[PDB]
Amino acid sequence: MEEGMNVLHDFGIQSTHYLQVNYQDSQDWFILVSVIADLRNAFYVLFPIWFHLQEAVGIKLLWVAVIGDWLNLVFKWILFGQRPYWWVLDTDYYSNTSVPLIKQFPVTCETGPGSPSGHAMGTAGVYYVMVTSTLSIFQGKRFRCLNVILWLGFWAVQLNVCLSRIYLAAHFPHQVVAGVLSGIAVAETFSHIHSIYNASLKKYFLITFFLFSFAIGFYLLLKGLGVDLLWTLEKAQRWCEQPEWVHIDTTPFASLLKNLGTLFGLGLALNSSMYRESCKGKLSKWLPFRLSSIVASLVLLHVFDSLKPPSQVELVFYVLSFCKSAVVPLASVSVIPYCLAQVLGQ
C-alpha cells in the first residue's frame, strides 16, 4: 500500500507557475530575500548584536542554529527529495496531458537534495528566539500592540522566505512548510534546556566529538548497505538549462565542520580566562562600551570574512574552514572586548 505524491508535486508546480506568470517585476526582490536568509548572517551579524545586549540570547541563538544545521544535514542524507524544476522535464505525469512552462533563473539549478528547506528552517529557528526573547524582556512596561506587531513581523518574514523559495523553482510548498515547523520545534525545545549555560570546557569537547563521530558513522553505515548518495549530480546536470550555471562541489563534509568549529570556539571563548576580565570586568558594563564593542566586532568580522581556503588540497581546506569557524566566536567576545578595555586604560 504505497501511492505516489504526484498530487503534491503538481500542486507545487502549479503554484510556481501561478507565482511566476503574474509577479514578473519582482524577481530582484525575491532574489534579495533568498540571499539575505542565508545562515551566514546569524554567526556574523545577529550573534554579536544580541550577545552584548543580553548574554543569554546569543548562546541560545547560536545553539539553535548549530543544531538546526546538524539536523538538516542528517535528515537530508536519507530523504531523497525532488525539486520544482527537474521534475517537470523528467516525470511522465504530464504524458497524456499538457506540460506547464517553467523558466530557470541563475539562482536556480541547485545540486543537492531538497527535502528539508535549510533557509526556512534556519530562519525560523533564529527568528523565533529573537521574538520570544524580546517579548520576555519587555515585560516591565495595552500590551496587545507590541505583541501583535512582533508576531505579524515574524510571520511576514516566514511567508516572504517561503514565497522566495517557491518562486525560484527550488522547493515545493510542503518542504518549506515542514522546514519552518521543524525550526520552530527545535527553537521551542531548546528554550527549556537550561544546562547549556555555564557549561564546562570538557562537556563542549565531548558534545562536539559525539556529533562528529555520529555523523561519520552514519555516513559510513549508509554506504555500507547500498544507499546511493550521488543521484542528485547527474540528473541536475542533465536537466539544468545551462551547464555554466551548475556549481558542482566536491565537499561531502562542508557545513558540518563549520558548525562544529563554531560550537567549539564558543565553548573555548566562554571558558577562557580572558573573557572573564574583558566582558565580566569591573565597571566596564556601561552601555556605550557595549555599543562600541558591537560596532567593532561587526566591522572587523565583515572585513575578515573576505578570505577563501585553498582547495588544491581537501584536508587543509577542511582544517582551515574549521579554524575560521572557530575564530568567528573566539574573536568577538574575548579579544576585541579586551582590546577595547585596554584602550579604555589609555
Residue numbers in the entry: 1 to 141, 147 to 351
The authors write:
Human glucose-6-phosphatase catalytic subunit 1 (hG6PC1) is a key enzyme in glucose metabolism, governing the final common step of gluconeogenesis and glycogenolysis, and directly regulating energy homeostasis. G6PC1 catalyzes the conversion of G6P to free glucose, which is then transported to various tissues through the bloodstream, supporting essential physiological functions. G6PC1 contains a transmembrane domain (TMD) composed of nine transmembrane helices and an extracellular domain (ECD) formed by two extracellular helices and two extracellular loops. In this study, we determine the cryo-EM structures of G6PC1 in both the partially open and fully open states, in either the apo form or in complex with the substrates G6P or F6P and the product phosphate.
Additionally, to explore the changes during substrate binding and product release in G6PC1, we determined its cryo-EM structure in the apo state at a resolution of 3.4 Å. Since G6PC1APO represents the ground state, the open state of the ECD in this structure signifies its lowest energy state. To illustrate the details of the substrate-induced conformational changes in G6PC1, we performed a structural alignment between G6PC1APO and G6PC1G6P using TMD as references. The TMD structures are nearly identical (root mean square deviation (RMSD) 0.504 Å over 1290 atoms), whereas the ECD undergo significant conformational changes and displays an ~1.9 Å displacement of the center of mass (COM). According to the comparison, we infer that the binding of G6P attracts nearby residues, causing local conformational changes, which leads to shifts in EL1, EH1, and TM7 toward the active center through extensive interactions within the ECD. Notably, EL2 undergoes dramatic rotation toward the active center, which, together with other changes in ECD, reduces the volume of the substrate-binding pocket from 1651.0 Å3 to 1364.0 Å3. Notably, these interactions are absent in the apo and phosphate-bound states, indicating that they are induced by G6P binding and play important roles in the subsequent hydrolysis process. Consequently, the unrestricted ECD tends to return to its lowest energy state, adopting a conformation positioned further from the membrane.
